[PDB]
UniProtKB/Swiss-Prot annotation, chain A:
PROSITE patterns: RIBOSOMAL_S14. Its cofactor is Zn(2+). Disruption phenotype: Cannot be disrupted; as the protein decreases in cells 70S ribosome formation decreases rapidly, with concomitant loss of uS2, uS3 and YugI (general stress protein 13) proteins from the 30S subunit. Keywords: Metal-binding, Ribonucleoprotein, Ribosomal protein, RNA-binding, rRNA-binding, Zinc. Binds 16S rRNA, required for the assembly of 30S particles and may also be responsible for determining the conformation of the 16S rRNA at the A site. This is Small ribosomal subunit protein uS14B. Binds 1 zinc ion per subunit. Belongs to the universal ribosomal protein uS14 family. Zinc-binding uS14 subfamily. The gene is rpsN1. It comes from Bacillus subtilis (strain 168). Zn(2+) binds at C23, C26, C39, C42. GO terms for molecular function: rRNA binding; structural constituent of ribosome; zinc ion binding.
UniProtKB/Swiss-Prot annotation, chain B:
GO terms for biological process: translation. Part of the 30S ribosomal subunit. Forms a tight complex with proteins S10 and S14. SMART domains: KH. SUPFAM superfamilies: Prokaryotic type KH domain (KH-domain type II) (SSF54814), Ribosomal protein S3 C-terminal domain (SSF54821). Pfam families: KH_2, Ribosomal_S3_C. This is Small ribosomal subunit protein uS3. Binds the lower part of the 30S subunit head. Binds mRNA in the 70S ribosome, positioning it for translation. It comes from the Bacteria. The gene is rpsC. Keywords: Ribonucleoprotein, Ribosomal protein, RNA-binding, rRNA-binding. InterPro entries: KH_dom, KH_dom-like_a/b, KH_dom_type_2, KH_sf_prok-type, Ribosomal_S3_C_sf, Ribosomal_uS3_bac-typ, Ribosomal_uS3_C, Ribosomal_uS3_CS.
From Swiss-Prot, chain C:
The keyword Ribosomal protein applies. Belongs to the universal ribosomal protein uS7 family. One of its GO terms (cellular component) is ribosome. Keywords: Ribonucleoprotein, Ribosomal protein, RNA-binding, rRNA-binding, tRNA-binding. It comes from the Bacteria. One of its GO terms (molecular function) is mRNA binding. Gene3D superfamilies: Ribosomal protein S7 domain. One of the primary rRNA binding proteins, it binds directly to 16S rRNA where it nucleates assembly of the head domain of the 30S subunit. Is located at the subunit interface close to the decoding center, probably blocks exit of the E-site tRNA. This is Small ribosomal subunit protein uS7. GO terms for biological process: ribosomal small subunit assembly; translation.
Length: 60, 206, 151
RNA sequence: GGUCCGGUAGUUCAGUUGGUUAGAAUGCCUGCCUGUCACGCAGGAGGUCGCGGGUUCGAGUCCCGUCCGGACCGCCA
RNA sequence: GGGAGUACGGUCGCAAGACUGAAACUCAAAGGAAUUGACGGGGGCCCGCACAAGCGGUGGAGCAUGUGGUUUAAUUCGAAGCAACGCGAAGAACCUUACCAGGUCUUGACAUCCUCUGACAAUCCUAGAGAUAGGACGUCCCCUUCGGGGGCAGAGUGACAGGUGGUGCAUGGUUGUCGUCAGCUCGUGUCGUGAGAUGUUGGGUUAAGUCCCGCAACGAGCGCAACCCUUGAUCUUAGUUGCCAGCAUUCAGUUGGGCACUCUAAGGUGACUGCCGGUGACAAACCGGAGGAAGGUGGGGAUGACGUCAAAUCAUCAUGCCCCUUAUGACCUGGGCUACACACGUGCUACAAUGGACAGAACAAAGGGCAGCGAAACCGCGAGGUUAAGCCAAUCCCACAAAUCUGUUCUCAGUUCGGAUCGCAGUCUGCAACUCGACUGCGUGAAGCUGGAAUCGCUAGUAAUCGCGGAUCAGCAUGCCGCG
RNA sequence: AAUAAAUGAUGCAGACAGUACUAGAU
């Protein structure tokens, strides 16, 4: 039940409070990201693939 | 846990950003739009053997650079191809989209197309030894200081799935300045799914 | 491998002494060195008040009394679990004296650690004292284990 | 059948004799160590005194009757 | 080969037993040598908070959280010593929600197919819990040289869709462990008729199979250091939204004014055994010595060599196979995911005099701000509410850090300790904190006075300990990430 | 006047599965 869940996410909620977040690429709730709106593994792979101009390997 | 790809590690050292722009209040929106554009262009030109596609934001204008290694198969007559490639993106995005097409010389050196050809040969029921060895020889004659290709999954067996290594030359993944081109490919066979991993060492920059 | 070096801060206006600085470093809890400094200052002031003498000499005599000369170290040679007396170097002697002083002072039990430490310094200057009970027990153990003065 | 001894934690034995009070081990459980086990260590619960009466402020305990498991005689011609 | 040097028979012997010596049955191995690895309570040698010495905890108590047992309308599912148990899941009132009670639907919630009829939407009454209908107001679509095409809704057909359904003992992809340990390999040549060895063995040496010597071997790859980022000092480039000394003004660094200087963001330099003595083979290599911010990878981060655990994930995604399909799929209200006689991991608070309460005072470092962050003023003991400046940010704000210090006060008690459980009254949000947040005031206040075997982390700005900001977020952190 | 380097003996640790496991072609 993945694309059904995506369609439910896309549904117009009765109240705006009923809205929840999804990474817009897969059906993974539980720690979707706001700044990028991309799933954890998806965002990681995409950043590794040269996209996301702002994010790079961090060192401190 | 195992090694990490060099694509995400070499950024800032030598490799530039495949996406070059400064956005605001629409970062994730533009990122999703570009992801959809890349998905569509890959599914469309999957037969045209396109390696990578860069995009640049130009204040409501989008400049797309495409590396295909074969112009006559991506531009062809010039008109029909450019129309079919640009108007579709324009309609599916909502604003102007400009396309530029570069040709990769020595097409047997880029990991993306190398893995694509290996996966095609595998799907053509070619032996996992003949195809690998032939591709390695092709790359080495084209010119590369090191080539590494790995295939894992069911290579003809049902109970066990194992990996295979075949590489010649120097592939120093730990050397930061290596400009190693890395790319992955998948091959869905009748016995299951096969995964192709290829990272090619082209040379170091002083 | 091998030993390692270290250092401390000597200068202290109230009864300047490197051993006093080491004691201040000790008795400190929760990174609150100011509390320990104030406690030591007030305890030395109470000592000087009750006893018409400089607290420095009293503290030196208390340390000379509590300092253990011989240490009894355990050693398991077979199913016997023997012990071996050991000569304590002056550094270890001073550290053990400070440990016993602080521990037995806080164990005594009074209305303030200041008064506790003052009375402990007194019962140390006068050999009859809690830390001196530990000293005597250690000396008794060392004497009983004299059979192994050297392996 | 006739005399004598006992019926107590789940098990084996104390406690009864001194009337106002139930103990030791084993056993089980919890915990700790051990990869898993045993071994090992720290705790917890668990008997209502075979059964029914009587003296009592009060009976596991004193005196009775009964059912059990035992120790011996059940002979003389 | 076991049967079996056994049974019968015979000879010997006082006896013990000795000599001779089968068969049935049963298995396709039993056995010898040597090669590689593995292990050892065999030896030599080395180091990792491992041990030794300590700083503080867990294990006793309350709470929070998670896991197994037991209980349920469901308590969705995975993970199970190191390598599961503050883990997926970086925030369950509905929504997330999977699981369950009930009301429902079946080209279906979602995407391609086909025939048409034309825009759908948007306001309003009834059933509603709503799914959904009964419906009314109402549909304005466009493009062409008249066919048609570009979406949306509907009306019929079946290809289909759905699978958080199973298989991680079929897989791709992604990670944990050995392990940041130092080893794992290849071309040529030699030896051994063989598996294999030689290179990688021997000596010195290092964090390293790092390096040097010898060398029946010569070279090379994956590793290791290296160049990557951060910090520790300096020259120059630049002073506004930074700094304020020299200058003059200010209640305020607020103004004119300077870029002296912290500072920030750029190019360089620098530390690279660079130099000297000693040791060592004269080498590799080690101790000391001047400089210097930096002396022997300066500290830290990224970087995890071949392979092992049929390790974890069919739940992020795809995935062959198997299975359901008017249902193992889909819509909605409510419930459950948060129940506890229980036990156990992790964390927070407590048992008090280094203390409790009250008065005064100083210093912060990093990060965020557009339906977002929100100065200042007012109201209220209070959480917070009203008007609202400013800020798309070195400007303005979040945001007056607390520990700490100087004073007043109490006094060794289950207490002026702790605030849990608790009754009431309120605050933030949101349709609604009732199963179901946090916070505040009122009145009380136990468990608890240091906690059993045993066990855990920590060698320097580390331990311990006090605050600060962000993720997930309408509103929710003792956990996470970092900072001081 | 000189000045010697010793000394060594350690007690305990029992078991772990029945059936399981990788392939290659001039």
């Amino acid at each position: 039940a993945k694309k059904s869940m995506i369609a439910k996410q896309q549904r117009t909620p009765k109240f705006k409070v009923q809205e929840y977040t999804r990474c817009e690429r897969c059906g993974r709730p539980h720690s979707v990201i706001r700044k990028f709106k991309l799933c954890r593994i998806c965002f990681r792979e995409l950043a590794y693939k040269g996209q996301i101009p702002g994010v790079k390997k961090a060192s401190w | 846990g195992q090694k990490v790809n060099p694509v995400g590690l070499r950024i800032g050292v030598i490799r530039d950003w495949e996406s070059k722009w400064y956005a605001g209040k629409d970062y994730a929106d533009f990122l999703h739009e570009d992801l959809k554009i890349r998905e569509y262009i890959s599914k469309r030109l999957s037969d045209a053997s396109v390696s990578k596609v860069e995009i640049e934001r130009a204040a409501n204008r989008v400049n797309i650079t495409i590396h295909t290694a074969k112009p006559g198969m991506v531009i062809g007559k010039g008109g029909s191809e450019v129309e079919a490639l640009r108007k579709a993106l324009n309609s599916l995005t909502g604003k102007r989209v400009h396309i530029n097409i570069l040709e990769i010389k020595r097409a047997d050196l880029d990991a993306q197309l190398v893995a694509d050809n290996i996966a095609r040969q595998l799907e053509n029921r070619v032996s996992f030894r003949r195809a690998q060895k032939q591709q390695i020889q092709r790359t080495m004659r084209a010119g590369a200081q090191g080539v590494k290709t790995m295939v894992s999954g069911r290579l003809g067996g049902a109970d066990i799935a194992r990996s295979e290594y075949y590489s010649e030359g120097t592939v120093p993944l730990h050397t930061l300045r290596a400009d190693i081109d890395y790319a992955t490919s998948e091959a869905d066979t009748t016995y299951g799914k096969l995964g192709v991993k290829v990272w090619i060492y082209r040379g170091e920059v002083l | 491998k091998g030993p390692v070096a270290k250092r401390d801060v000597l200068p202290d206006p109230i009864y300047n002494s490197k051993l006093v600085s080491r004691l201040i470093n000790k008795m400190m809890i929760d990174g609150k060195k100011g509390k320990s400094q104030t406690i030591l200052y007030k305890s030395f002031d109470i000592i000087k008040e009750r006893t018409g003498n400089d607290a420095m000499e009293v503290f030196e005599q208390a340390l000379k009394n509590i300092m253990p000369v011989l240490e009894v170290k355990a050693r398991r040679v077979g199913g016997a679990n023997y012990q071996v007396p050991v000569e304590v170097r002056p550094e270890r002697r001073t550290t053990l004296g400070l440990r016993w002083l602080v521990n037995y002072a806080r164990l005594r039990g009074e209305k303030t650690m200041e008064e506790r430490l003052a009375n402990e310094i007194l019962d140390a200057a006068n050999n009859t004292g809690a830390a001196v009970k530990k000293r005597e027990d250690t000396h008794k153990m060392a004497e009983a284990n004299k059979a192994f003065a050297h392996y």
